[model samples]
Every structure is written in C-alpha cells, then in structure tokens.
Target: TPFMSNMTGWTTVNGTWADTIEGKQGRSDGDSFILSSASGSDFTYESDITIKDGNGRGAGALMFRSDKDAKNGYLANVDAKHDLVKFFKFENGAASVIAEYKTPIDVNKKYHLKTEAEGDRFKIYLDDRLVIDAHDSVFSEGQFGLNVWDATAVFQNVTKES
Candidate 1:
C-alpha cells in the first residue's frame, strides 16, 4: 500500500499535514517520516538533512538493515557533543557502537549523507566523503528510513534503490 500522512507543523512528502506525533505543540523527539520496502531486497539509501533549529540536538541517521519493529538496524548518527559521525546497531534492544569519525558541519546547515550495503560490506558517506566502512551480514535486506532522536531536522531528496 502506498500512503502518506503528516502531523500539524509537520509536512509529508505528499504535501498533507496533520497533528504532530504525540500531540506536541511544536515537534517532539522521535518525530519522523519514513519510506521503506516491504519486499526483501538489498539497496542503498541517501538523504540531505538540514538542522532547522540550532538548539535541537541529539542524534539522527538513516536506518538500514532494520527489522519490523525498527530496533535491529544500523544507525549512522551525528554526535552533538563531539560533532562527529558514528555508526551503531541495536541487538536485543541494546545499541552498540560500531564505528566513529570526525566530520565538518555548520549548525543549521544542510549536509548530504548516505549508507550503502552490498553483501556483508557496509559503507557510510558524508558529503561524498567515505567515513565508515564495515562488514555486517546480520540482516541482508530490510527497510530504510529517516530518524530524529531529539532534533528538529528537515530531510529532503531521500532515495533508496536496489
């Protein structure tokens, strides 16, 4: 089924709007829009994210190798305090760090990021720079989506292709 919906103050890719998730007046943590495949297929995901609110912090990333509940997937996050990029994974509801890297970004500025998986090799990119390269064959094919742990961000031009 193809569907699209949004909470008030939040816009869906299809242009409709509704109340924000959790009924928050502004936006809440964990508020996000996602697109993923129900079919099993290996693919690559990418997006351009803009931190609309400078005060917003925490972590966010493209989720890959995700399970039905979205708890078991790889997360490439932007660490607020360190201002660096890092990769993580959730196993049995516990998140474990896989890798980390230093990245350059200006607050409230837009940045291009991507995550690709082919077989057991995983790759992450920041503005065309290869930042993370790892190997994980845990989940071969799964859904991909945008995430906002505790940040107000705008994601555009998100794409996933096999």
Candidate 2:
C-alpha cells in the first residue's frame, strides 16, 4: 500500500508537526512526533525536518517501525554534535547503532530525509542521497514519524507509501 501526509492535517502532534516543537532536555529536545496515524509494513516514508535552532547539543531522526513508547523502533538520526547520521535499533529503552554516515547537518537547515522498510531491508537518505542501508528484522510493523532529540525542529510534507 502507499501513504502520504501533509504533516500538518493530522492530529498527530507534539503540538503541531508543522511548527517548531519546544521541549526540555539536559542541555537541550522530545516526544515531539506525529506519525502517519496508520500502521503497516513494507512502506516508504519521507519528510523535511528542519533543525530550526538548538543548544547545539541536539539531533533529529526519520523514524519508522516504532512502538508507541518512543523506544523500541528503527530510526535514522543525525547527531548535531557529532555531525553524523546514524541508523539505530531502539530496543526496550536502549538504542544501539546499526550504521553511521557522516554528514554536514547544519543548524537552521532543512534536511530532506527519506526512509524505507520492506521485508528485512531498511534504508535512509539525506537530500536524496543514500546515507545508509541497514538490514534488520527486529521490527516488522509500527508507525512512521519524526523524532527530535534535544533539538528544535519543524516537520512538513511527509511523503509515505504504506
């Protein structure tokens, strides 16, 4: 199946997917997320999540196959401090890296991120360029959303194919 969301019209909000999400952190980010409101397997999801501004100790991710808790899922994130894009498996309450790609994740810049999950294949892209391709069957089905880690971000135009 295929899916798409304006990233604005959904009730899915940590306030509003279209606006900057504000939250608290140690040096900071959130539970700031707005999923597709539908769940499925074998889908493609993409969006522009701008790292609007931050304490310079934050990050963001294109998330997929995520359990409701915000943990236990597959996510490709950018660590602003490290300037790297990483694919992770969030299990229970711990996140472990599956792969990492160095990137120029600039502040106040909108990164066009895309993600796909089909069978056991998972991939992530930045600015339409392949950043990482990881294979893991740890998660089969969940939701599609964006995650901000100690960072302020705005999400819009989620292109998804469920």
Candidate 3:
C-alpha cells in the first residue's frame, strides 16, 4: 500500500513529501489532508519540514493521533508567513487551535519537528527546542503522518517512536 495513496492527496518523490493542494486558502474534499502511515496511541512523531512556497497563511504540519480518515486528530504546523508554529485539533473535519508560539521561521529553512503524545498530554518542538505544550483528549489513538496546507513543504526523516 502507498499509505492510502489514492486518497491521501500527497506524493513522495524520493524521501521528500509534497502536498497536492494549498491548505491556507482552504481544504476541499478532493484533497486528502491527513496521511497516517502508521497507527498508534502513545508515541513520538518526528520530521523535518522545509517550505518551498508558502504564501501568507500557507503551512506545513506533522500529524499524530489521527483517526483513519483524519477527521479527528492533532497537528503541529509551521506558518513562516506568520512566523509561528501552531498546534491544532481536528474535530469532525473542522480545526481548532490548541496552542501556538511566535517565532521567525524562514521559507526554505529546514526545521526539525517533533510531537509527543501520551495519555492526555501533547508537546510540540521545533529545531529540538520546545515550542508548544498542551493537554487534551480530542482523539487519542490513531495514525500519524506528514501534512501540508495550501503550500508546498518537503518532509524528510519522518519517524515514530514508542
């Protein structure tokens, strides 16, 4: 399986992943927003995201604890246009911000991202530094993957640790 390829709306060229649609402008049903290549509950999701062309509002994210279709999950996204890294919860396909931090992030600069989820706790890190930390029980047990929104982001070394 290509990790739900026909429905994921993403492409993997070599080891880098690119989104099929722009997430900033908005996401439609045609575009698969989540990619949960693996299923788990308590784990760490890690990746390196590099923005290629994210306009004001364009974003790239790391997804974790997402349901099968990603209807319910949590994501940590970086929007360089806003100079921020945001964490969110996707409920019934609608997203709500949980926590965020303001930090200058330049396009084309690689950012090492990590997310840890255990019980009702969630933490997000950038470049190995803590960025966002919160606790929630929105959707705890599910899949994980690399995500993008209304922008192009190349991801590498996507890993999950138990």
- Listed in order, each prediction's TM-score against the native is 0.73, 0.79, 0.78
Pairs that collide, model 1? 7-18, 7-19, 8-18, 8-19
lDDT tens string, model 3, 39-79? 78998877777777533435678777777666778889887
TM-score of 1: 0.73
The lDDT for every candidate, in the order shown, is 0.59, 0.67, 0.68
lDDT leader:
3
Q: What is the per-residue lDDT of model 1 for residues 31-138, given as tens digits with 9 covering 90 to 100?
A: 343435532346667766655453356455666676666666777766453577777776775678788897654545667778777887878888888999987766
lDDT-best of 2 and 3: 3
How many residue pairs of model 1 clash at the backbone?
A: 4
lDDT: worst 10-residue window of model 1: 1-10
1-162, model 2: which lDDT tens digit per residue?
A: 022344332435453333323321112244355555556678888776566555455677777787776567888776666788888878996778889998677776777778878899987888889978989889998876677667766555666776
Instruction: TM-score for candidate 2, please give it.
Output: 0.79
**Local distance difference test, candidate 1:** 0.59
